[PDB]
Structure 1
Amino acid sequence: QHLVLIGFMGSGKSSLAQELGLALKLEVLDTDMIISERVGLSVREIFEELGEDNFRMFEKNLIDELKTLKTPHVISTGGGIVMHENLKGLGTTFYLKMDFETLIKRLNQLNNLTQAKELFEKRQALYEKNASFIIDARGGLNNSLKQVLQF
């Protein structure tokens, strides 16, 4: 019953979450921002100062915490959130699916993209394992929004 958006950073999750919240009259949460606000450091400062182990532990526990909310929320999530076995059951999960070339274009706001593409294929497989629905993100925000509402 929460509507959880998963996928790569730069796919459009935050913007889609905001629109979804408006369309459905739902409050919107962002897991990276909640963690950042609890610790008082930015996500990058957390990784630098406190280490990824701490970040991942905060993320795992926050997943548990949100499972206790009674009212449905739209939840956007960090790219690594699918590493957690407990993400399953948080809510209905939508993978905002962009092809690699589009995503690299969006992120760009000698072997070069080989490693990026390996990381892409491995993380995409985890997004799909964890998804209730796959949204085709290639048509832009409104087309993604339309899919979610129809689904």
Structure 2
Amino acid sequence: QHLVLIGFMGSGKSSLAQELGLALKLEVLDTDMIISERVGLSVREIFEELGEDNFRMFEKNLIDELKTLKTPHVISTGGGIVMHENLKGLGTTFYLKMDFETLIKRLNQREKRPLLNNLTQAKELFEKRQALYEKNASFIIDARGGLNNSLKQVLQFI
């Protein structure tokens, strides 16, 4: 019963996460960051050098490991974390809901997947991911306004 942020790259998870940890004085984890740093490659180079399924295995395992932590944390999560059957039960999740249009400018990158530098593939991924964010959301948050306006809605779910 972590506070888990989800949704697509550039919807503002890590920044919300660093703000929520501060406001709530909880520790903040970032799954992409933890993997990149255990592996010693950017997430880009993980994809390039090691392939998506191996990244996806590093995500599956980290989810389980995060589940064993005692104290609640604020966790931001990579774009595809929802691909994982084992997210459910990590924590209370908050979907940072964005439209593709707003999203674009901000998702110019590093932890960015090579497919996310193809915009039509990006849009197709985005579309296919909508249903997965919704299915894995404890709460859905209109992320279109600022960091504050997302913060507002988060906190009311306590």
* TM-score bucket of the superposed structures, by smaller chain: over 0.9
Inter-CA distance 90–120: structure 2 relative to 1 (3 Å threshold): same
Give the drift of 1:108: 5.1
> Structure 1, residues 77-96: CA drift from partner, whole Å, max 9, x if none?
10011100001100000010
Instruction: Tell me how far apart the structure 1 counterparts of residues 63 and 135 of structure 2 sit (CA, whole Å).
Output: 17
CA distance, structure 1, for counterparts of residue 108 and residue 44 of structure 2: 19
Greater shift after overlay, 34-43 or 65-74?
34-43
| Residue 100 (structure 1) aligned with residue 106 (structure 2) | no
How far is 1:29 from its partner? 0.2
Q: CA shift at 1:23, angstroms?
A: 0.7
| Residue number in structure 2 paired with 1:52 | 52
Q: Give the match's secondary structure for 1:138.
A: coil
Alignment coverage as a number of residue pairs: 151
Moved more, 70-79 or 34-43: 34-43
Change (3 A) 1:113 1:89: same
Runs of 4+ in structure 1 displaced over 6 angstroms?
109-112
Q: Distance in 2 between matches of 1:66 and 1:108?
A: 29
Partner Cα distance (2:148, 2:28) in 1:
18
* 1:105 Cα offset (Å): 3.1
Displacement of 1:50 after TM fit?
1.2
1:90-109 deviations in whole A, cap 9, x for unaligned? 00000100112111233358
Runs of at least 5 residues in structure 1 that lack an aligned partner in the other structure: none
How many Å apart are 1:137 and its aligned residue? Answer: 0.5
Structure 1 residues 18 and 133, CA gap change in structure 2 (3 angstroms): same
**Shift of the alpha carbon at 1:116?**
3.6
Provide the rounded CA distance (Å) in 1 between the counterparts of 2:154 and 2:48: 36
Point out the more displaced range, 90-99 or 48-57. Answer: 48-57
Instruction: Flag the 1:139–1:53 CA change in 2: closer, same or farther, 3 A.
Output: same
- Relative to structure 1, the CA distance from residue 68 to residue 139 in structure 2 (aligned partners, 3 Å threshold; closer, same or farther) is same
State the structure with more CA Rg.
1
The runs of 5 or more residues in structure 2 that have no matched partner are: 110-115
CA drift of 1:38 comes to 1.1
